[model samples]
Target: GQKVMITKMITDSVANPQMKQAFEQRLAKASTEDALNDIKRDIIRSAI
Candidate 1:
């Protein structure tokens, strides 16, 4: 089996704030799930 990589970009101004902040914070801590969840939250929040 081959591994697949997924990439997401936050272009919307509203969601970008939280998403970018989460990404940078996670990078500083070397955390993956937290950052991903933040991005997920941003997308879902905007959808509602």
Candidate 2:
């Protein structure tokens, strides 16, 4: 019987160009309240 559960995670790497581009784009668009609100809603939805 299993007594515990484990999960693996990976950190973002500098070599991931797509991820880097997404990070840059997110930073650029983070100035707007509307954008942040949408992100908050998405996070809430995912949490449920």
Candidate 3:
């Protein structure tokens, strides 16, 4: 239940259009290879 609730909360956050805007802009501005490497590092760190 706790895991489910946490997942739902994360999903809700991602579901917000406003929240996506800033991240999208950051993504849009990033150079492709540099952005992918940066994003991958971030995701791996966070997931770990």
Best-performing candidate as measured by lDDT: 3
Global local distance difference test of model 3: 0.47
lDDT, candidate 2, 1-48, per-residue tens: 110110000112233556445544554566566765554444335334
Return the clash pairs for model 3, or none. Answer: none
Query: If both were scored by lDDT, which would come out higher, candidate 1 or candidate 2?
Result: 1
Off by over 4 Å in 3: 1-13, 40-48
Q: Model 1 over residues 5-43: C-alpha lDDT tens digits?
A: 112333433355776566445434544666666655554
lDDT of 3 by residue, 11-36 (tens): 44555565445444554566566665
Error of 3 at 3 (Å): 30
Q: CA lDDT of each candidate? A: 0.46, 0.38, 0.47
In model 3, what is the error at residue 19, expressed in angstroms?
Answer: 1.8
Number of backbone collisions per candidate: 0, 0, 0
The number of clashing residue pairs in model 2 is 0
Could you tell me the TM-score of candidate 2? 0.39
